[PDB]
Amino acid sequence: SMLARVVRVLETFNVDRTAQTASDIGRRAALPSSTAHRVVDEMVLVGILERGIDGKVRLGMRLWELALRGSMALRLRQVALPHMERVQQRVREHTQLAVLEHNEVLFLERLSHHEAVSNLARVAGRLPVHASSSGLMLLAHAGPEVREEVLSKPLPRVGPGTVTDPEALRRLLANAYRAGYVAAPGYIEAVATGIAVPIRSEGVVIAALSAVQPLQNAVEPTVEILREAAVGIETDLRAS
Amino acid sequence: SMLARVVRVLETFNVDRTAQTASDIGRRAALPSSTAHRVVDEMVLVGILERGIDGKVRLGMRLWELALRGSMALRLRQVALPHMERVQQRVREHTQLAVLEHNEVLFLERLSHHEAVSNLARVAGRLPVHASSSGLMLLAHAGPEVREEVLSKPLPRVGPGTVTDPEALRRLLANAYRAGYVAAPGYIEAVATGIAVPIRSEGVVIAALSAVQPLQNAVEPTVEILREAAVGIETDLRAS
């Protein structure tokens, strides 16, 4: 399909790849040279891609506009940001907002203080569900079918502290469901603890609000600050 | 063509329209029912759209991700946002970031205090180039061909203060170029003044940084704050 070829072209761009030649796009998308050059030209023609004065193609401003305007991602981030900014003022590490997408964590927003701890979460970037405080919080509220899919895959260690045993994960998830937060000491990187709380709309967890902070930092203060922020978000969501 | 039909479907969504029926999409996109369902179903299949439990379709999280990942609009917003938050802390009204796109203003970012003045600028939304502080500041640096296009087209008044006389506009643009700022009292709404300054990169104005504040607030102090923020953004643009 033309739409399938267009999506494969979009998929060649990534969090640290802004500009490509049609030949490189063809190679990354496993598309024949002629097909890659034709599809790229059509995408440039409608403004989904733009061609710079360097002759390389980039994701187009028209694509950005059509994808964000009125979107669930933009509306939630908009409601969330003032509350995320207050957490950032208080904790001065990282505040981020995430959803589940195809059994991975996708980040809608990330606020970072200068010389905060190392953080691998990227806006419009992904991390594993089982290893991420955000992922474990959201997976705790997913159906048994979603939990089974995720729990039945080989589960790599991401950081030193990553829990990979399916039944140990079920115990974590039950505790997180009960407690209304996940602390994840060194589950992504040795130096970092992720802490995540749920964001609810009409009694459904739609997102996770998280902090990333040095491993040795107190957990309880951050948990409380995120809960307060999450309450603010749910209030503001209910009337938006 | 299928790519053309897909773009027309994306175009039926907007800043104020999040969820539609395939029937409503078919009406707005000029597609007969069968074609509207087929294109929407295929876009739902590749995750470009999502179909809710209410049976309504929405812009997809996968589309948001593929459009924003490593995008020019994300990179510039990322560099700008900390400086924009400092301005927002000081002025406590609205701070926003805009570019020119097809001779209209397109907003990349907007920060708002909950008790701020009425503001009609939306992220991934547009305002007229002649009527917004952001548009006038960007059009002052657009070069002669774009300038004459805008000065020769229909120029309606938007708010009470909108300057519509083409020669009075020519003067404003020449003054804006020299002064390095635009104050636009009631050009969009009676209650509000837009104030915009340029963001340069490689000696080219690529964006406008703007505040929207009550008509009665003093302009000079907001100009100074935006100039400082703009220098900060430019330094971090040179360093990246």
Short mmCIF file of C-alpha atoms in Angstrom, two decimals:
data_model
loop_
_atom_site.label_atom_id
_atom_site.label_comp_id
_atom_site.label_asym_id
_atom_site.label_seq_id
_atom_site.Cartn_x
_atom_site.Cartn_y
_atom_site.Cartn_z
CA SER A 1 0.00 0.00 0.00
CA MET A 2 1.07 3.66 -0.60
CA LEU A 3 0.13 4.40 3.09
CA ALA A 4 2.26 1.39 4.24
CA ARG A 5 5.28 2.68 2.18
CA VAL A 6 4.72 6.25 3.59
CA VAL A 7 4.74 4.90 7.24
CA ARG A 8 7.96 2.84 6.59
CA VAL A 9 9.59 6.10 5.31
CA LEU A 10 8.46 8.02 8.49
CA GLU A 11 9.86 5.09 10.58
CA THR A 12 13.42 5.69 9.15
CA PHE A 13 13.57 9.04 11.07
CA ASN A 14 14.24 8.75 14.83
CA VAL A 15 14.96 10.64 18.10
CA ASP A 16 18.55 11.55 16.93
CA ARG A 17 18.03 11.40 13.09
CA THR A 18 16.48 14.60 11.58
CA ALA A 19 17.79 14.53 7.96
CA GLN A 20 18.32 11.70 5.41
CA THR A 21 18.84 11.22 1.63
CA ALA A 22 16.11 9.19 -0.18
CA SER A 23 18.82 6.50 -0.86
CA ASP A 24 19.52 6.19 2.93
CA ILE A 25 15.70 6.15 3.62
CA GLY A 26 15.44 3.34 0.99
CA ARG A 27 18.20 1.34 2.77
CA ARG A 28 16.72 1.81 6.31
CA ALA A 29 13.10 1.06 5.15
CA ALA A 30 14.21 -2.03 3.05
CA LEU A 31 12.51 -0.27 0.05
CA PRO A 32 13.88 -0.53 -3.55
CA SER A 33 15.80 2.66 -4.63
CA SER A 34 13.19 3.62 -7.33
CA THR A 35 10.24 3.10 -4.87
CA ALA A 36 12.07 5.05 -2.06
CA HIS A 37 12.83 8.03 -4.42
CA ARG A 38 9.20 8.15 -5.77
CA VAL A 39 7.53 7.89 -2.30
CA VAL A 40 9.92 10.53 -0.79
CA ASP A 41 9.16 12.96 -3.72
CA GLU A 42 5.36 12.50 -3.20
CA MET A 43 5.80 13.08 0.59
CA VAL A 44 7.89 16.27 -0.07
CA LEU A 45 5.21 17.41 -2.63
CA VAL A 46 2.38 17.31 0.01
CA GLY A 47 4.67 18.79 2.78
CA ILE A 48 4.81 15.58 4.94
CA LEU A 49 8.61 15.82 4.37
CA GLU A 50 10.59 19.01 3.58
CA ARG A 51 13.81 19.25 1.52
CA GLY A 52 16.46 21.59 3.03
CA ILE A 53 19.07 23.79 1.17
CA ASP A 54 21.45 20.80 1.90
CA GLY A 55 19.13 18.65 -0.33
CA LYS A 56 18.43 16.17 2.54
CA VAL A 57 14.78 15.47 3.59
CA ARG A 58 13.37 16.07 7.13
CA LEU A 59 9.99 15.49 8.86
CA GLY A 60 7.83 18.40 7.59
CA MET A 61 6.26 21.20 9.68
CA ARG A 62 2.88 20.35 7.99
CA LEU A 63 3.16 16.74 9.34
CA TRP A 64 4.01 18.12 12.84
CA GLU A 65 0.94 20.44 12.66
CA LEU A 66 -1.54 17.79 11.36
CA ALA A 67 -0.28 15.24 13.97
CA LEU A 68 -0.43 17.53 17.08
CA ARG A 69 -3.43 19.89 16.56
CA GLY A 70 -6.25 18.74 18.93
CA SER A 71 -4.38 15.41 19.56
CA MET A 72 -4.78 13.38 22.81
CA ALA A 73 -0.95 13.75 23.22
CA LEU A 74 -1.02 17.60 22.95
CA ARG A 75 -4.17 18.07 25.14
CA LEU A 76 -2.84 15.82 27.98
CA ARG A 77 0.68 17.44 27.86
CA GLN A 78 -1.00 20.93 27.91
CA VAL A 79 -3.13 20.06 31.01
CA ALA A 80 -0.10 18.29 32.63
CA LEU A 81 2.71 20.86 32.00
CA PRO A 82 1.93 23.47 34.77
CA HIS A 83 1.68 20.57 37.33
CA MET A 84 4.89 18.95 35.90
CA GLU A 85 6.65 22.37 36.16
CA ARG A 86 5.79 22.60 39.94
CA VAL A 87 7.21 19.05 40.54
CA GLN A 88 10.34 20.18 38.58
CA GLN A 89 10.62 23.35 40.80
CA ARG A 90 10.43 21.14 43.97
CA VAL A 91 12.57 18.04 42.99
CA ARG A 92 14.93 19.77 40.43
CA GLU A 93 15.73 16.39 38.72
CA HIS A 94 13.39 15.09 35.93
CA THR A 95 9.57 15.10 35.55
CA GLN A 96 8.10 13.09 32.61
CA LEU A 97 4.71 11.89 31.28
CA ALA A 98 4.28 8.51 29.51
CA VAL A 99 1.70 6.17 27.90
CA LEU A 100 1.73 2.51 26.83
CA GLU A 101 2.05 2.04 23.01
CA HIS A 102 2.49 -1.51 21.54
CA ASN A 103 3.70 -2.91 24.94
CA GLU A 104 6.45 -0.23 25.27
CA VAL A 105 6.61 3.07 27.25
CA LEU A 106 6.33 6.18 24.98
CA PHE A 107 7.19 9.59 26.58
CA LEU A 108 4.83 12.56 25.83
CA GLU A 109 6.98 15.09 27.78
CA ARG A 110 10.24 15.41 29.79
CA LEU A 111 11.43 18.40 31.94
CA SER A 112 15.11 18.29 33.05
CA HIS A 113 17.23 20.46 35.41
CA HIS A 114 20.84 21.22 34.32
CA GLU A 115 23.25 18.57 35.80
CA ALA A 116 20.32 16.37 36.95
CA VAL A 117 21.09 12.57 37.04
CA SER A 118 21.49 10.63 33.71
CA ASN A 119 18.03 10.03 32.10
CA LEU A 120 17.41 7.84 28.97
CA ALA A 121 13.70 8.82 28.51
CA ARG A 122 13.30 10.96 25.33
CA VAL A 123 10.19 12.90 24.15
CA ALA A 124 8.62 10.71 21.39
CA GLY A 125 11.13 8.03 22.55
CA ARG A 126 10.51 4.60 24.15
CA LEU A 127 11.80 2.47 27.10
CA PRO A 128 10.92 -1.15 28.08
CA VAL A 129 7.64 -1.64 30.09
CA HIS A 130 9.11 -4.16 32.66
CA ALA A 131 12.24 -2.05 33.47
CA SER A 132 10.62 1.47 33.60
CA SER A 133 8.82 2.89 36.72
CA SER A 134 6.32 4.40 34.18
CA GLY A 135 5.96 0.99 32.41
CA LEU A 136 5.39 -1.02 35.65
CA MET A 137 2.81 1.54 36.97
CA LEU A 138 0.86 1.39 33.64
CA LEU A 139 1.23 -2.44 33.26
CA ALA A 140 -0.21 -2.78 36.83
CA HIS A 141 -3.49 -1.26 35.45
CA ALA A 142 -3.49 -2.99 32.00
CA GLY A 143 -5.77 -6.04 31.44
CA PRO A 144 -4.55 -9.62 32.14
CA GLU A 145 -4.11 -10.07 28.31
CA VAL A 146 -1.63 -7.10 28.04
CA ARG A 147 0.20 -8.26 31.25
CA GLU A 148 0.45 -11.85 29.81
CA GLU A 149 1.80 -10.61 26.40
CA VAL A 150 4.52 -8.50 28.18
CA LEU A 151 5.31 -11.18 30.85
CA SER A 152 5.63 -14.03 28.23
CA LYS A 153 8.45 -12.25 26.23
CA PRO A 154 12.15 -12.74 27.08
CA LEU A 155 12.80 -9.87 29.58
CA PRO A 156 16.35 -8.42 29.27
CA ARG A 157 18.12 -6.71 32.23
CA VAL A 158 18.30 -2.97 31.27
CA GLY A 159 20.13 -1.77 34.41
CA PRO A 160 21.74 -3.77 37.27
CA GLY A 161 18.47 -3.77 39.33
CA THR A 162 16.01 -4.82 36.53
CA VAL A 163 13.50 -7.53 37.72
CA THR A 164 13.17 -10.15 34.89
CA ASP A 165 11.37 -13.05 36.70
CA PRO A 166 7.68 -13.11 35.63
CA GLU A 167 6.29 -13.95 39.14
CA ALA A 168 8.59 -11.35 40.86
CA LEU A 169 7.12 -8.82 38.33
CA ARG A 170 3.50 -9.92 39.21
CA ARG A 171 4.36 -9.22 42.92
CA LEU A 172 5.78 -5.74 41.98
CA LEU A 173 2.64 -5.02 39.85
CA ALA A 174 0.22 -6.07 42.69
CA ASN A 175 2.17 -3.84 45.17
CA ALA A 176 2.10 -0.91 42.65
CA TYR A 177 -1.68 -1.43 41.99
CA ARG A 178 -2.28 -1.35 45.82
CA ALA A 179 0.17 1.46 46.73
CA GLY A 180 -0.58 3.79 43.75
CA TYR A 181 3.16 4.29 42.94
CA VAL A 182 6.28 2.35 41.72
CA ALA A 183 9.86 3.09 42.88
CA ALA A 184 12.37 1.42 40.47
CA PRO A 185 15.89 1.65 42.00
CA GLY A 186 18.51 1.10 39.21
CA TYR A 187 16.01 -0.72 36.88
CA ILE A 188 17.21 1.43 33.88
CA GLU A 189 20.64 2.78 35.08
CA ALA A 190 22.70 2.07 38.27
CA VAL A 191 22.77 5.84 39.14
CA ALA A 192 18.97 6.41 38.81
CA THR A 193 15.62 5.61 40.53
CA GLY A 194 12.41 6.10 38.49
CA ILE A 195 9.25 6.84 40.57
CA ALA A 196 5.83 6.79 38.81
CA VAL A 197 2.17 7.48 39.81
CA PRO A 198 -1.01 6.91 37.75
CA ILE A 199 -3.10 9.58 35.95
CA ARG A 200 -6.81 8.58 35.73
CA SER A 201 -9.64 9.75 33.39
CA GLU A 202 -13.19 8.37 34.05
CA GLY A 203 -11.67 5.68 36.36
CA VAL A 204 -9.09 4.46 33.74
CA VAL A 205 -5.27 4.90 34.08
CA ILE A 206 -4.38 6.71 30.79
CA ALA A 207 -0.79 7.79 31.70
CA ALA A 208 2.05 7.72 34.26
CA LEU A 209 3.65 10.81 35.84
CA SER A 210 7.23 10.00 36.91
CA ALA A 211 10.42 11.48 38.34
CA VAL A 212 14.00 10.25 37.62
CA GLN A 213 16.42 11.05 40.53
CA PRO A 214 19.80 9.83 41.89
CA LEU A 215 19.45 6.30 43.48
CA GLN A 216 20.45 7.57 46.99
CA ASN A 217 17.77 10.36 47.06
CA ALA A 218 14.81 9.94 49.47
CA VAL A 219 11.79 8.28 47.69
CA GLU A 220 8.85 9.25 50.00
CA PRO A 221 9.09 13.05 49.37
CA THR A 222 9.09 12.53 45.53
CA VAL A 223 6.15 10.00 45.74
CA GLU A 224 4.03 12.60 47.70
CA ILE A 225 4.98 15.48 45.31
CA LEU A 226 3.99 13.31 42.24
CA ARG A 227 0.63 12.26 43.86
CA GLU A 228 -0.19 15.98 44.50
CA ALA A 229 0.73 16.80 40.85
CA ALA A 230 -1.36 13.78 39.63
CA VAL A 231 -4.43 15.05 41.64
CA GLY A 232 -4.00 18.53 40.06
CA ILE A 233 -3.79 16.93 36.56
CA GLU A 234 -6.97 14.80 37.17
CA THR A 235 -8.87 17.92 38.43
CA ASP A 236 -7.80 20.00 35.37
CA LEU A 237 -8.52 17.03 32.99
CA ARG A 238 -12.11 16.60 34.39
CA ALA A 239 -12.88 20.21 33.23
CA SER A 240 -10.92 20.55 29.88
CA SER B 1 -4.23 9.33 -4.87
CA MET B 2 -4.24 7.43 -1.54
CA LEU B 3 -1.58 9.77 0.00
CA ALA B 4 -3.79 12.80 -0.99
CA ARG B 5 -6.88 11.12 0.62
CA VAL B 6 -4.86 10.35 3.82
CA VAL B 7 -3.74 14.04 4.13
CA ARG B 8 -7.38 15.21 3.53
CA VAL B 9 -8.48 12.88 6.42
CA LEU B 10 -5.75 14.36 8.73
CA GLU B 11 -6.97 17.86 7.69
CA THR B 12 -10.53 17.13 9.04
CA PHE B 13 -9.04 17.08 12.60
CA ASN B 14 -8.11 20.50 14.11
CA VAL B 15 -7.10 22.34 17.35
CA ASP B 16 -10.83 22.28 18.45
CA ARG B 17 -11.82 18.84 16.92
CA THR B 18 -10.26 15.70 18.56
CA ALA B 19 -12.79 12.87 17.83
CA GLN B 20 -14.87 12.22 14.65
CA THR B 21 -17.03 9.44 13.13
CA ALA B 22 -15.77 8.07 9.75
CA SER B 23 -19.13 9.52 8.43
CA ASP B 24 -18.17 13.08 9.62
CA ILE B 25 -14.62 12.52 8.22
CA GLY B 26 -16.16 11.52 4.82
CA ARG B 27 -18.27 14.75 4.76
CA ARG B 28 -15.36 17.08 5.75
CA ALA B 29 -12.73 15.32 3.50
CA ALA B 30 -15.06 15.11 0.41
CA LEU B 31 -14.82 11.24 0.39
CA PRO B 32 -17.84 9.03 -0.39
CA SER B 33 -18.73 6.72 2.61
CA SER B 34 -17.01 3.54 1.23
CA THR B 35 -13.72 5.42 0.49
CA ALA B 36 -13.83 7.30 3.85
CA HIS B 37 -14.25 3.94 5.77
CA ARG B 38 -11.48 2.19 3.71
CA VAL B 39 -8.91 5.04 4.17
CA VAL B 40 -9.81 5.54 7.90
CA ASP B 41 -9.71 1.72 8.52
CA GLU B 42 -6.22 1.48 6.90
CA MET B 43 -4.98 4.55 8.90
CA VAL B 44 -6.36 2.89 12.13
CA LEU B 45 -4.52 -0.37 11.10
CA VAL B 46 -1.08 1.41 10.84
CA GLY B 47 -1.85 3.43 14.05
CA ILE B 48 -2.00 6.86 12.23
CA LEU B 49 -5.54 7.08 13.71
CA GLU B 50 -6.98 5.35 16.81
CA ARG B 51 -10.61 4.14 17.13
CA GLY B 52 -11.98 4.57 20.70
CA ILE B 53 -14.49 2.30 22.53
CA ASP B 54 -17.04 5.08 21.60
CA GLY B 55 -16.40 4.11 17.91
CA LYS B 56 -14.98 7.63 17.19
CA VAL B 57 -11.54 8.00 15.50
CA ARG B 58 -8.73 10.32 16.81
CA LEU B 59 -5.16 11.27 15.70
CA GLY B 60 -2.98 8.30 16.81
CA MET B 61 -0.13 8.29 19.39
CA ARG B 62 1.99 6.50 16.69
CA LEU B 63 1.38 9.50 14.32
CA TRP B 64 2.33 11.99 17.12
CA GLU B 65 5.55 9.97 17.78
CA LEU B 66 6.63 9.58 14.09
CA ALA B 67 5.94 13.33 13.37
CA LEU B 68 7.82 14.73 16.44
CA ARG B 69 10.80 12.26 16.84
CA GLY B 70 14.01 14.24 15.99
CA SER B 71 11.79 16.88 14.23
CA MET B 72 12.92 20.53 13.67
CA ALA B 73 9.79 21.63 15.66
CA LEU B 74 10.78 19.42 18.67
CA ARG B 75 14.51 20.45 18.58
CA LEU B 76 13.71 24.22 18.51
CA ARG B 77 10.98 23.90 21.22
CA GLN B 78 13.47 21.84 23.36
CA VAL B 79 16.23 24.55 23.11
CA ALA B 80 13.61 27.35 23.71
CA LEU B 81 11.54 25.81 26.58
CA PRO B 82 13.81 26.52 29.66
CA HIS B 83 14.25 30.20 28.58
CA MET B 84 10.46 30.38 27.88
CA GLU B 85 9.77 29.06 31.45
CA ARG B 86 12.00 31.86 32.95
CA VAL B 87 9.90 34.47 30.97
CA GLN B 88 6.69 32.70 32.14
CA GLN B 89 7.95 32.88 35.81
CA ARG B 90 8.56 36.68 35.46
CA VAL B 91 5.49 37.84 33.37
CA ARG B 92 2.97 35.09 34.52
CA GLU B 93 0.72 35.67 31.41
CA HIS B 94 1.58 33.76 28.14
CA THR B 95 4.95 32.95 26.48
CA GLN B 96 4.83 31.42 22.96
CA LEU B 97 7.13 30.46 20.07
CA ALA B 98 6.13 30.76 16.36
CA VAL B 99 7.48 30.31 12.80
CA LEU B 100 6.14 31.45 9.40
CA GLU B 101 4.49 28.62 7.42
CA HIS B 102 2.85 29.48 4.02
CA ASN B 103 2.69 33.23 5.05
CA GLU B 104 0.71 32.54 8.28
CA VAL B 105 1.93 32.25 11.92
CA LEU B 106 2.19 28.64 13.25
CA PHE B 107 2.82 28.29 17.03
CA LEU B 108 5.36 25.60 18.15
CA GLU B 109 4.86 26.30 21.91
CA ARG B 110 2.59 28.17 24.38
CA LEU B 111 2.97 28.50 28.21
CA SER B 112 -0.07 30.00 30.07
CA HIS B 113 -0.75 30.98 33.72
CA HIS B 114 -4.28 29.75 34.76
CA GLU B 115 -5.41 33.40 35.46
CA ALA B 116 -3.82 34.96 32.29
CA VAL B 117 -5.61 37.19 29.70
CA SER B 118 -7.59 35.59 26.80
CA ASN B 119 -5.12 34.18 24.17
CA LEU B 120 -6.19 32.79 20.72
CA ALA B 121 -2.72 31.34 19.80
CA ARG B 122 -2.77 27.50 20.04
CA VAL B 123 0.13 24.98 19.63
CA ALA B 124 -0.07 23.58 16.03
CA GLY B 125 -2.65 26.37 15.33
CA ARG B 126 -2.35 29.53 13.17
CA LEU B 127 -3.02 33.29 13.33
CA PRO B 128 -2.86 35.92 10.53
CA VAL B 129 0.69 37.24 9.82
CA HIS B 130 -0.41 40.95 9.55
CA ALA B 131 -2.45 40.94 12.83
CA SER B 132 -0.13 39.08 15.34
CA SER B 133 3.04 40.53 16.97
CA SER B 134 4.77 37.20 16.02
CA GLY B 135 3.67 37.50 12.35
CA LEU B 136 4.75 41.18 11.97
CA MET B 137 8.19 40.44 13.59
CA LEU B 138 8.74 37.41 11.25
CA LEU B 139 7.37 39.25 8.11
CA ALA B 140 9.79 42.17 8.89
CA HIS B 141 12.68 39.65 8.17
CA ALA B 142 10.97 37.62 5.34
CA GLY B 143 12.51 39.55 2.36
CA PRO B 144 10.77 41.64 -0.30
CA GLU B 145 8.80 39.02 -2.34
CA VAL B 146 6.94 37.60 0.75
CA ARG B 147 6.44 41.19 2.08
CA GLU B 148 4.70 42.28 -1.22
CA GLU B 149 2.57 39.06 -1.30
CA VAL B 150 1.15 39.92 2.18
CA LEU B 151 0.84 43.72 1.52
CA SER B 152 -1.14 43.06 -1.73
CA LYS B 153 -3.61 40.44 -0.28
CA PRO B 154 -6.92 41.09 1.56
CA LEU B 155 -6.06 42.48 5.07
CA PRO B 156 -9.15 42.29 7.33
CA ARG B 157 -9.07 43.85 10.83
CA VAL B 158 -9.10 40.98 13.42
CA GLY B 159 -9.20 42.97 16.71
CA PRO B 160 -9.97 46.72 17.12
CA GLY B 161 -6.28 47.78 16.77
CA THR B 162 -5.32 45.75 13.61
CA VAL B 163 -3.27 47.91 11.13
CA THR B 164 -4.76 47.10 7.64
CA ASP B 165 -3.53 50.10 5.50
CA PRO B 166 -0.68 48.55 3.41
CA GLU B 167 1.56 51.69 3.69
CA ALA B 168 1.05 51.96 7.51
CA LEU B 169 2.06 48.22 7.62
CA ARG B 170 5.18 48.94 5.49
CA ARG B 171 6.18 51.57 8.15
CA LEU B 172 5.47 49.16 11.09
CA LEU B 173 7.63 46.41 9.40
CA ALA B 174 10.55 48.87 8.75
CA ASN B 175 10.32 50.11 12.42
CA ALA B 176 10.07 46.45 13.70
CA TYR B 177 13.21 45.46 11.67
CA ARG B 178 15.12 48.42 13.24
CA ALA B 179 13.71 48.20 16.83
CA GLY B 180 14.05 44.35 17.10
CA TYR B 181 10.52 43.99 18.64
CA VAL B 182 6.78 44.49 17.80
CA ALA B 183 4.14 45.67 20.33
CA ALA B 184 0.63 44.96 18.91
CA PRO B 185 -2.00 46.53 21.22
CA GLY B 186 -5.44 44.90 20.54
CA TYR B 187 -4.47 43.59 17.03
CA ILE B 188 -6.12 40.18 17.84
CA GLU B 189 -8.35 40.96 20.89
CA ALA B 190 -9.22 44.31 22.58
CA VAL B 191 -8.17 42.87 26.02
CA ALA B 192 -4.63 41.79 24.91
CA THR B 193 -1.27 43.10 23.58
CA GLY B 194 1.14 40.77 21.69
CA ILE B 195 4.89 41.53 22.07
CA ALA B 196 7.35 39.58 19.83
CA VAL B 197 11.16 39.52 19.38
CA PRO B 198 13.26 37.60 16.81
CA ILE B 199 15.24 34.35 17.33
CA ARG B 200 18.31 34.31 15.00
CA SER B 201 20.38 31.25 13.95
CA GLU B 202 23.31 31.53 11.48
CA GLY B 203 22.32 35.24 11.05
CA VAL B 204 18.74 34.25 9.91
CA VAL B 205 15.53 34.99 11.92
CA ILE B 206 13.97 31.46 12.15
CA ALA B 207 11.29 32.16 14.83
CA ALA B 208 9.54 34.76 17.02
CA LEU B 209 9.42 34.61 20.84
CA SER B 210 6.25 36.36 22.08
CA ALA B 211 4.31 37.33 25.23
CA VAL B 212 0.51 37.90 25.27
CA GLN B 213 -0.43 40.19 28.23
CA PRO B 214 -3.38 42.42 29.29
CA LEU B 215 -3.68 45.65 27.20
CA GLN B 216 -3.02 47.83 30.32
CA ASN B 217 0.34 46.19 31.38
CA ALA B 218 3.52 48.17 30.51
CA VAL B 219 5.31 46.98 27.33
CA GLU B 220 8.94 48.04 28.04
CA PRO B 221 9.53 45.53 30.92
CA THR B 222 8.13 42.57 28.84
CA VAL B 223 10.30 43.61 25.80
CA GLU B 224 13.49 43.51 28.02
CA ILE B 225 12.56 40.04 29.44
CA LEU B 226 11.91 38.61 25.89
CA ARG B 227 15.20 40.11 24.51
CA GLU B 228 17.15 38.41 27.40
CA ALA B 229 15.32 35.06 26.79
CA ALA B 230 16.02 35.34 22.99
CA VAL B 231 19.82 35.79 23.61
CA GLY B 232 19.74 32.67 25.89
CA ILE B 233 17.94 30.64 23.14
CA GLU B 234 20.48 31.92 20.51
CA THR B 235 23.57 30.99 22.68
CA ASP B 236 22.16 27.42 23.23
CA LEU B 237 21.37 27.29 19.44
CA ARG B 238 25.06 28.18 18.61
CA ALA B 239 26.33 25.63 21.24
CA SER B 240 24.14 22.83 19.71
#
